[PDB]
Amino acid sequence: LGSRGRLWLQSPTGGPPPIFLPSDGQALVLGRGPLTQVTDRKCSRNQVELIADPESRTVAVKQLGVNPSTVGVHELKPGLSGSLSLGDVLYLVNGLYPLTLRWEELS
């Protein structure tokens, strides 16, 4: 359903604006900062690194932070990675601060 488009992360209602991911393969680090608006000290400023794949509509997520991120139903550890498909949630830290993967068409 739609060959060309951009992948982005949706925050809870009344949260930060859409976080669109580089469609060229470049990495995007997320964590405590103005992009996610998370101020929780348990969340790292470099919590996860994301690499988007628009063709498969998936996102690879590597944990860099000390405290556990959760990608779907898989809780990560530092150095480990999980995968997000459309509709899957990324919990930035300790089962909190969910970000849902969505797809915006160009047409």
Binding site: R32, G33, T39, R41, K42, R45, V66, N67
Partner: peptide, 7 residues
């Protein structure tokens, strides 16, 4: 945003 991370 600029604090050290907890544990």
């Amino acid at each position: 945003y600029d604090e050290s991370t907890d544990e």
